[PDB]
Structures are given as C-alpha cells and as structure tokens.
Design a protein around this ligand. Structure first.
Ligand code: FAD
Ligand code: FAD
Ligand code: TFB
Ligand code: TFB
Lengths: 386, 388
C-alpha cells in the first residue's frame, strides 16, 4: 500500500465529471503544437482516403504458427516496423487449457528470442501475453490466490525473455483485473533475478478512470526499480463488455468512461505524462487514429532516438496509416505490429473485439471511410470539442 | 392436478438434466433408415457441390434495409423466385421504458407496412414479422415474471391483433435460456385468447441446443390441440451458445441448460424435426438452418407428400440465399424458404451482428467448414446421428 496505490483505488469509480478537468488541462496543447498536429493529421488522412475482411478473420492473423509468422515478418522489418507476437488464447477454463497456453508462450519465446539474434528489446521482436490464459480461474478466483499461482509461471516466462533480451508485454484485460496484474508487475520489477533486463512491458487503458494514476505508479516503480518499463498506452478493447457488466451490477459510476471523446482526452493527457518520463519508461503509443498519432508526434518534440518511444498498431489494421509514418521519407518513427498467431479456433474471441472496434460508428477506422465525415471533423482536437 | 402438470414438470425436469441422460432418446428419435440416409447424402452432396460452382465482417450483407419501406422494396426479387420474408426491426434488451416504447412503435408501424405489402397473401405465402420480447419490457432479464408478464402481455396481444387484422405471421424469437419459461407462458395466454381466434399466424422459436427443446415442443403441440391454433414453430439450433456457456459458468452450475458438444445439438435438431413432422395437422414447422446436411436430412424425413403450408425452411438474410437457391423452385427441391430480414442501422445492429460473427467465425459451424480446406465433402455430408 502507498499514496500512489491509494490514488488508483480511489479513482476506480470516480464520477466521470470529476475525472475530466485534470485530464482536460493535461491534454491542452499550445497553439503551435495544435496547428502543427492539425497539419500532420490532415496530411495523413488525405493519404488514408487515397487508400482504402471476411468473417474468417484472415486479415487479422499473422500466421498459424510462430515459425510461419516469423518468416512473414522480414519484409516489414526492413521497412522500419517491429513485431510483438501474440499466441492467441485467453480466459482459460481448465488446468489443461492454461498449461497448453503456457507451453505455447514458452515455445514462442524460444523461437522469437532466437530470431531476435541479439537485436534487443527496441530493434527486435517481442511477445505479448494474457494473464487470463495462464490461470484456469483468472476472473473467478480470489485475486491473492490467483496472483500467487500465476507469479511463478510469469516469472519463468520473463526469465526466458531476459535470456534472449526480448520484450515481454502483459496485455490489459477486464477492469476488475487491473489491480492483480499491477501487483504482479511490481513483484517482477523488484525481482533481482530479472535485473539488467528492460523488456518487461505493461498495457494501460485510457478508457479507464484509473489510467493516469496507474501511470504515476508505474513511472515511479520504473524510477525506483531501475527497470525501464515498456508502457503500452491504449484506449481499450473491452468497452462494450465493461458497460454491460456495470449496468448489471447496478453501478451508477462505471470504471470506464461512457463518452468516446472522454477516452480521447484521457489518452492525450496520459501521453503527455508518458512523454515527460521517457528517461524511466519506454512509451508505446498504440493507436490507429491519425489525429491521436499526429498529436503525440508533435507533443514528443524534435529529439528522437530509437528506444525513446514507439508507436504500435494491430496487424491488418494499422499498415495503411503507418506506411505514412515509418521510414526516412515519412515521419521516421518506428511502429511495432501486434501480430496474432494461431488457428481459426483460438482466433474467435479476438475477432469479436475487432468487430466491435471496426464496426462502431465512433471508431476512427470506420469514420475514415464514412462519406458523411469530413476531414475537418477527423482532425478536430478532442479538448476543443469536449 | 395443475393444468398441464405432466407436460410442465417435464420441461422443468429437463432444464439442467445431465447431457448424457438427455441424449439416448434423441439419438433414437433422430435415427433414419439406411435408405433414407443414402438418399439424404446424395442430396447433401449435390447442394454442397452447387454451393461452390455458383459461388464481410462489417455485416452490411446482414441488413435488408434501414427502414421497413426500404426493406419491403428490396424483397420483390426474391419473392418473385418463391422466397418469403420475416422482417425484424432490430433492437433488443431495452434498458428503459422509453426504449421499450420506441421498439413497440417500431414493431407496430412495421406490421401496418408489412400487412399492406402482404395484400391478402396470408401467413404462408406472404411476409411476416419477428419480435423479441426483450425489446418490449425494460430489464426483461431482471424483473420478476409477474411484473414482466403483466406489462408485456397487453403489448404483445396488441401487436398480435394487428397481425391478425392483416393476416400475417408474427413470430416470437427465442433469446437467452432463462427467459424460455416466461415466453412460453405468454404464448399459451395468447393462444387461448378468444380475441385472436381464426388467425394462425402466431409463431414461436424453439432452440435445439437446449435440453428442454423436445419437452417444450410437446407442450406447444398439445397447446395447439387444445387452443385450436395451428402454431408456427421455428426450429433452430440457437444463437447464444457462447454467452450461455459463460453465464452457466458464472452461475456455478454443475450442468448447463444447453449442450456442450456441437453434434449433440445436431442430433437434438433432427429428433425434434421428426416430432414436428408428425404433427403438421396442428403446427406449421419452419426448419431454420444453413447446414445442407441438416436440410437434406429433413427434406427426406418429410417424405414425398408436400404442399405449401405443410412446412417450410428458413434462412438468415446474407447467409442462406446461395444454399436455398438450390432448394426453392420446381427444378430444385420444390420447397419454400422464408428469409429472416433485419431492418435498422448501426444504432440497433450490434447485438445481432456479434451473434453472426460468432456463428460465421466458429470452427464448428457448417458455414465455416464449407470454406475449410481440411474438411472433406464426405465429412460435410456425414450424418452426425451415426457418430453417436
Ligand atoms: C498494438 C495495440 C495493442 C493493444 N493492446 C490492448 C490491450 O492489451 N488491452 C486493451 O484493452 N486494448 C488494447 N488495444 C486497444 C484496442 O484494441 C483498440 O485497438 C483501441 O482501443 C482503438 O483505439 P484507436 O485510438 O485506434 O481508435 P479510436 O477510434 O480513436 O478509438 C476507439 C476507442 O474508443 C473507445 N470508446 C469507443 N466508444 C466509447 C465510449 N462511448 N465511451 C468511452 N470510450 C469509448 C474504445 O476504447 C475504442 O476502442 C491495443 C491496440 C493496439 C493498436
Ligand atoms: C431464419 C432463422 C431464424 C433463427 N431464429 C433464432 C432465434 O429466434 N433464436 C435463436 O437462439 N437462434 C435462432 N436461429 C439460429 C441461429 O441464429 C443460427 O443461425 C443457427 O443456430 C445456426 O445453425 P445451422 O444449422 O445453420 O448451422 P450449424 O453449423 O449446423 O450449427 C451451428 C450451431 O450449433 C450450435 N453449437 C455450436 N457449438 C456447439 C457446441 N460446442 N455444443 C452444442 N451446440 C453447439 C449453435 O447453436 C450453433 O449456432 C435462427 C436461424 C435462422 C436461419
Ligand atoms: O486482445 C485484444 O483485443 C487487445 C488488442 C491486442 C491486445 O489486447
Ligand atoms: O437474433 C438472432 O441472432 C437470432 C437469429 C434471428 C432471430 O434470432
């Protein structure tokens, strides 16, 4: 327990109207930055609108096996992309399923680590894992017991990632498991067996009210532990399910925002916090929204080196945008592709979240193709609109 | 004894009966002769081979129109070929009274439009409507059945009266397993309501993935006999499987209200089809499926005697037309098919579209397996009843 942890717990269901003022202030940019970002966003969107899958989900899977996915990665790697591979799987319901997912992650780390061949955590590939894949009652058992049995499995995977010097990211799932996953991150960052490795990564969801306070805790943890934690800032993939759970629970105040523009303001405010902490954390700005991207690109300033920060996108969604970003002819910033690996069976749940993401009228990836939506609207600054 | 005590006790007893105890009577009822199985395999092979010689996640292909007027206009082409329609004004799980009132008015306006378009074609040849009870009562899943019944019954009765006045079909869609009992009690009250006399358009869905399915059918067939209504019965597998599994896990159940082996649902469907085909005097069976093997099995089970009004097939808009173009029509199988036609926009599409992705994306689904290079035609035409 700490002042930083208390701020997280107190924010869990803080009224939405009380959450917004500090985010609005932090997301407010100078006129020079706003004008530059609007110019960059317009250029990106005009390029996107010069560009343009089925329910088999083929668009979203990088390969059936890690061997297949690694072979298919060379073309984009020399263009300036990197990869984070995800062996598909989540919400294990039996011990056998959790054991199989563990074996999949373990085998992937060996293949990815060998393929990395000493490129390190920024220039080379990494892996993403879901804690719900590794424990058979992740959401239905007591958090203390879940973390206790989960810890040795995650530590063993992190030790392999350290052996090869690759990144290992913990994906963020449902809101009620944020606290458990954060306790696990803290144990790992204080574990001397992992010293000298900066590959531990952690996702924080800007649609969540606790997001800035989680970031304060992580930034402080990185600074005191000496681990340069990789922090993937996302909006969030489970919004519809969080709303349904909160409505059923009789909750007046939800753990997530209910207006999309509030999530957008939260993201920019949290990006400002991360960009002020690049000494101690490695921010990873995961977004397909060209306005969000352009804002961060200008907020980050003129100084850049590989390892300072990166962007990220999902395989099958982000390539049109990021082909306008990576490379010396564009913005010369790197992007890491989240690359699902698996069979069609393990793909299904991930596909549902992609459908909720692509099919929502509020999503950038839907609006970019909507004839009713103007470029002027797409480049709007969320602080100015809210 | 309480009215229908034996039939009602059989439904309740089946609710969470162990799967292994449910299956033996279904396997026997679903067993067909070698001669019929050979003929059905030949028909299924032809249908699948056609399904490839003649021929999106965002699901524009699943919605017939944004308004009922638009949907009705777009229906003329397939009606000309011999298809019929059941229109669904998209929307469900009303969270407020205002939402439930909005959906009620959507349905009411749709019945007037569909009824005008029907122009006296009647309940079999002409279009109908499908409704979801969760759209018409706020917190349908949460409120006690006493409060839900007392407010929902007058609304559904009013819609049924409008459908009677135009002589069109009005079908109650089946939703989550925990609302089966309420919906069935509502069906009974409507079927015994003299104000609806002379109209056979009331319809009801039964889900063959549910353990209660044959016992619900027994209750419905008996209800048809005592009410004098020829109840339209849509036999489906079911659309909420993934959600039912998750809910039963969170409910702490040792035995779930749905089957967990996919071929058990197939056996259940065929057994229930045999029961319906033996009761066509008092119910109108509507076999909703996109599975060519299921379709062929029922086509042969039904035998050589057919007339429009005996039974029909059904399919979802954007899924079933390629298969049923090999079914409807004299040179094909000469059997009718009704298309379930959603009407709405992105604001009301989400829940339905999720169920379509889970249906189309699942490795166990026929519509996925037909495009799977690892699945032989032999496997697609195999009778699942012989596996068990
Ligand atoms: C590489 C990568 C990794 C990711 N990892 C994770 C992860 O581990 N865990 C996770 O949960 N997400 C993760 N995400 C995010 C998620 O999968 C979506 O991709 C992301 O939220 C889309 O945001 P955007 O900026 O591209 O799009 P935008 O269109 O700008 O934003 C869409 C987002 O807004 C939010 N939203 C929509 N409607 C509302 C509303 N009414 N009220 C409040 N908020 C709303 C949702 O978060 C939605 O996804 C990841 C994304 C990427 C690109
Ligand atoms: C016109 C029409 C109307 C419909 N109306 C309704 C309705 O009101 N309510 C409703 O719930 N459904 C309804 N359905 C059914 C549902 O929407 C699907 O279309 C249907 O279940 C798919 O069955 P199939 O025979 O086409 O395909 P198949 O591929 O043969 O069967 C797939 C089905 O098997 C079941 N299943 C999958 N995995 C398992 C498993 N592991 N264990 C047990 N069972 C499993 C599911 O029911 C799944 O949909 C309707 C379908 C049609 C065509
Ligand atoms: O699984 C999901 O949908 C998100 C995107 C990638 C990681 O977590
Ligand atoms: O809504 C659904 O998904 C099913 C199919 C049509 C009616 O009920």
């Amino acid at each position: 327990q700490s002042t930083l942890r208390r701020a997280i717990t107190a924010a869990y269901r803080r009224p939405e109207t009380e959450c917004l003022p500090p985010l609005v202030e932090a997301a407010t940019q100078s006129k020079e930055i706003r004008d530059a970002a609007a110019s960059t966003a317009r250029k990106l969107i005009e390029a996107l609108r010069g560009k343009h899958g089925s329910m088999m989900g083929e668009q979203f899977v990088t390969g059936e096996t890690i061997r297949e996915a690694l072979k298919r990665s060379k073309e984009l790697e020399e263009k300036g992309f990197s990869y984070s591979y995800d062996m598909l799987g989540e919400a294990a319901t039996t011990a056998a399923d959790a054991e199989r997912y563990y074996r999949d992650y373990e085998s992937a780390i060996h293949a990815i680590g060998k393929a990395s061949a000493g490129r390190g955590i920024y220039e080379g590939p990494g892996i993403s894992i879901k804690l719900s894949a590794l424990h058979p009652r992740y959401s239905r058992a007591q958090a203390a017991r879940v973390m206790g049995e989960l810890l040795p499995r995650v530590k063993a995977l992190a030790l392999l990632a350290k052996n090869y010097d690759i990144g290992l990211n913990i994906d963020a799932e449902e809101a009620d498991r944020l606290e458990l996953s954060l306790d696990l991150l803290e144990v790992l960052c204080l574990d001397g067996d992992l010293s000298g490795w900066n590959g531990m990564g952690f996702v924080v969801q800007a649609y969540g009210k606790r997001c800035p306070f989680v970031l304060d805790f992580i930034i402080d943890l990185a600074r005191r532990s000496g681990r340069r934690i990789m922090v993937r800032l996302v909006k969030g993939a489970y919004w519809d399910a969080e709303i349904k759970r909160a409505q059923l629970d009789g909750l007046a105040d939800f753990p997530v925002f209910t207006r999309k523009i509030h999530t957008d303001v939260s993201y920019i405010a949290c990006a400002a916090k991360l960009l002020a902490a690049t000494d101690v954390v490695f921010p990873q700005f995961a977004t397909h929204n060209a306005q969000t991207l352009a804002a961060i690109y200008h907020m980050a300033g003129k100084d850049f080196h590989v390892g300072k920060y990166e962007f990220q996108c999902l395989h099958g969604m982000g390539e049109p945008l990021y082909e306008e970003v990576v490379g010396r002819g564009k913005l010369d910033r790197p992007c890491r592709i989240y690359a699902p690996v698996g069979t069609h069976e393990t793909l299904l749940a991930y596909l549902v979240r992609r459908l909720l993401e692509n099919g929502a009228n509020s999503s950038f990836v839907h609006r970019i193709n909507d004839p009713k939506v103007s470029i002027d609207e797409l480049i709007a600054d969320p602080v100015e609109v809210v």
